[PDB]
Design a protein around this nucleic acid. Structure first.
Lengths: 146, 64, 116, 206
RNA sequence: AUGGUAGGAGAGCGUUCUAAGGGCGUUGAAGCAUGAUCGUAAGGACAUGUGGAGCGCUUAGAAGUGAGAAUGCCGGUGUGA
RNA sequence: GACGACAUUAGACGAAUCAUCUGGAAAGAUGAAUCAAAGAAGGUAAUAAUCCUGUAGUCGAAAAUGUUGUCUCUCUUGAGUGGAUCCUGAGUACGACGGAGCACGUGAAAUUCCGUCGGAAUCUGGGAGGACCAUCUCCUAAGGCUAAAUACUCUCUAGUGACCGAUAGUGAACCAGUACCGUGAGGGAAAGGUGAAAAGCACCCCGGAAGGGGAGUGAAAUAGAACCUGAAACCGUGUGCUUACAAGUAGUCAGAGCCCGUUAAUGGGUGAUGGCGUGCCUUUUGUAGAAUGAACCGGCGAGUUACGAUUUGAUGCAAGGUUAAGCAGUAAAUGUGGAGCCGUAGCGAAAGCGAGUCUGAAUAGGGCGUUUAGUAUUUGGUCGUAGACCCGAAACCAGGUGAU
């Protein structure tokens, strides 16, 4: 293109709305705020959650629970993701990472039985689901808990 | 700077899969003898934050 | 970058001043009261464009009543006779005919009469 | 996807194949626009400022009593409705630069070069043999090669002699293959390359 | 189908600056003054006087981007006389 | 230590143009040439790469050394095992009471400090690992010194700007923290422009002079120092139409008569007379309102920016998408950089289980979920944190000034 024939994509750009610049805009005098009150005032408005003195929702309601600071979360992978590999291959966490199926090994890798495998391979991981191990061994293959 | 989270709401509510907020029920933790067993067991059922309240308290839990 | 209020204020006010030509005193020199009058002037003109038609129809009807009462006939009965005889002629053209050619006006007054 | 490699005489030296992936795509004008606007924004130093009512000198005391006797109520001579000063919402020192994805950047470059090639605004030569800088000789070279007023010349890595030769001519700009940019590509009407630089850009954009 | 205040949505006119392109100017630029001109509006030209050096147009991009009112601020000037 | 460019710094050299037209004067127009490691910039009677100062670049000396390369002396070519015995920081550690600081609200305070009272162990020792006990892991207090990366700029040198251009921008472009105000601490202005060149009006006339009229300089003197341009309010002099029987938000629609003659188009100016007609803004159920505000004119004068969230539009890639800091680069683009972030699976307080999970004794029944599409930057709208659309209090506190 040419700098003197520049043109943006359609729908990419709008002009901003300028308030307080006369009647014919429809945003002139009050600038959209209405006439009086707490919200017409500069810096006005009421803080979020404030209900006017009625007890807020998050004090009507009770708290419950606690957080486990040392919690185990596992990088999840299903059978339908393993179909990209070849039969007889031996898959490992490092091979998963290299293939990009797993971006982050959090506390180990876990294999879940959502999809359909249609393959035959050996797997080495930390945890398995019962359906996953069953569907691995059904077509042929082994699961070795690391 | 960063937005700050409302901690009292954070340890009162959790976020479901789609976008909703699951809460706990009030009128527990104290006198039940005036109440019936039906009320007792039914106040153990969870509920969702109403949309009318979400329209007000959305920004308090954006990082949840 | 800074932009200062140059020449646009003056042009905008000046053409209003020019619209205010012929007004009394300060109303052709001062922007505020000149502007106030021009707005009023336009509103007046808007309603007078419509009052004009009423006024002229009123004039034509007065003239036709006069022309008929020389032939011993009222406006009301003349126009009922015209309508019954089929004449779809304007009150304006009637007035002008009555002023210019009295003979033709008599000639169609005869028709308005014999249609009753 | 074949282009004639010429000599400084302008006759010929051979022909070379160039990837249509780099020089033969359909240009994406939206991405071009975004890239050009980005590069123009990145050159600004947003070094502008005004003084607000707190930074204007003086204005500590209330100039007269709240009721006064017949006057308007005021709080400082440096308030914004006063001639003295106090700007409300003026410019502030800041930056206009922003970023966008590497894939978009590469796409913009490819689209620019493809536009320049399909407009017959691409020329490729053998090496520049400049043992000393001579603006006059470079002028004669650009006369032999029927080039327009605005032309971009791309060496492989760096040639200080041809840079010095072409520095002082209006309309001419000199760049490295690594240092190519969408702005100085699009501003030009023609693009002369050395074969080595062409191959380098081909490999780093393909 | 088209009255309209809080208010929501949309499309536009102008101001200063920047990029690129293409132009105007001592055979007289911008500003100022006048005019019976053009456009649905914001508003845009042309002609003539004054003035004596800078300024438009196209596309895009940034804003200290449009005042008649705030017992508003600053200057000039009236009225009462 | 011979130590081998402070920056090699004041400084010096530093290419290349003539003519005609208009002009008061050309750098402009026309035409023909030239230099370029120099087409950055500014002046010159108007707009100059080739007229001047200059620029690129080259040559350069004192205080100097770049503080840089073997650099005289001088350096540190290690002495390993057991550690059995001796030493290894006392009113200290530690404790109670009262307090403070640590993200922690003074208390189980774990950890670290102040005051008052007490007050030890010594390598088979002692301390820590969020009360306390035991096992394990780590360390060895009560002695000291320590560059770099980091923070700021009254200043200095060299520069930059989608910063201001005289009510702006420093309070201050000039006589500025000055005239001026105040006992004093302190507060605190207004005020730029002849012309290219002063060639800044010889001389004559009116006049006491100021002022002026001629003459003259000049391109221009309604460019004459109250000096570029010279708006409006306001003050006047002349005139074309009109007005002393008339009730008025001063205009509007109609309309004779009189005068003129345009951006020449079913034109302009005035207006005998008729009809209609209680200003604007704000606040109000409602305002001609005897409710508010504005003497007039001009100028100035109010939703903005950063960061984050959310949602729309645009684009790129897509079961994947994306870099942050830093580094190289012209204060750019770009390249590199994969620690991290979102998504690809949820349910449950949690252990945990997993396309299911939670409840339940039970799989039942029900709740949330599955039965695809996200992610990065950007545009608009809104919100949040910041003074957050602008002006405006009475008052509170801290430090000072005053008994003329």
């Amino acid at each position: 293109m040419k700098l003197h024939e520049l043109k943006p994509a359609e729908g990419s750009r709008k002009e901003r709305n300028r308030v307080g610049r006369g009647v014919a805009t429809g945003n002139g005098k009050t600038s959209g705020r209405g006439h009086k009150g707490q919200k017409a005032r500069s810096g006005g408005g009421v803080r979020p959650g404030f209900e006017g003195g009625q007890l807020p929702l998050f004090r009507r309601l009770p708290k419950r629970g606690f957080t486990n600071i040392n919690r185990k979360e596992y990088a999840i992978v299903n059978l339908d993701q393993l179909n990209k590999f070849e039969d007889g291959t031996e898959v490992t966490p490092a091979l998963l990472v290299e293939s990009g199926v797993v971006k982050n090994e959090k506390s180990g890798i876990k294999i879940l039985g959502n999809g359909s495998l249609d393959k035959k391979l050996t797997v080495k991981a930390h945890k398995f689901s019962a359906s996953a191990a069953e569907a691995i061994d059904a077509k042929g293959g082994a699961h070795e808990v690391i | 700077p960063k937005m700050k989270t409302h901690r009292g709401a954070a340890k009162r509510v959790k976020r479901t899969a789609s976008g909703q907020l699951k809460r706990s029920r009030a009128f527990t933790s104290h006198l039940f003898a005036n109440k019936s067993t039906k009320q007792k067991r039914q106040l153990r059922k969870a509920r969702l934050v109403s949309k009318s309240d979400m329209k007000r308290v959305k920004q308090l839990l954006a990082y949840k | 970058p800074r932009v200062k209020g140059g020449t646009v204020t003056r042009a905008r006010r000046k053409k209003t001043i020019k619209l205010a030509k012929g007004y009394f005193g300060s109303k052709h020199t001062l922007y505020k009261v000149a502007k106030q009058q021009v707005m009023k002037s336009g509103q007046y003109a808007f309603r007078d464009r419509r009052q004009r038609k009423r006024d002229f129809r009123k004039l034509w009807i007065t003239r036709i009543n006069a022309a008929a009462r020389q032939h011993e006939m009222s406006y009301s009965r003349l126009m009922n006779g015209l309508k019954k005889a089929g004449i779809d002629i304007n009150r304006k053209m009637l007035s002008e005919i009555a002023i210019s050619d009295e003979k033709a006006f008599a000639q169609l007054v005869t028709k308005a009469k014999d249609a009753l | 996807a074949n282009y004639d490699v010429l000599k400084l005489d302008g006759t010929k030296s051979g022909s070379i194949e160039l990837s249509d992936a780099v020089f033969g795509i359909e240009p994406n004008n939206s991405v071009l626009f975004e890239a050009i606007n980005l590069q123009r924004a990145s050159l600004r130093q947003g070094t502008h400022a005004v003084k607000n009512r707190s930074a204007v000198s003086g204005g500590g005391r209330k100039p007269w009593k709240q009721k006064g006797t017949g006057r308007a109520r005021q709080g400082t001579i440096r308030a914004p409705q006063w001639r003295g000063g106090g700007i409300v919402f003026g410019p502030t020192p800041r930056s206009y630069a922003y970023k966008m994805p590497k894939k978009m950047r590469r796409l913009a470059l490819r689209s620019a070069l493809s536009f320049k090639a399909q407009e017959n605004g691409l020329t490729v030569v053998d090496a520049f043999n400049f043992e000393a800088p001579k603006t006059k000789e470079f002028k004669n070279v650009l006369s032999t090669l029927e080039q327009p007023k605005k032309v971009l010349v791309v060496t492989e890595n760096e040639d200080v002699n041809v840079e010095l030769s072409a520095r002082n001519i209006p309309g001419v700009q000199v760049t490295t293959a690594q240092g190519l940019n969408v702005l100085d590509i699009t501003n030009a009407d023609s693009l002369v390359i050395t074969e080595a630089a062409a191959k380098k850009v081909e490999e780093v954009l393909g």
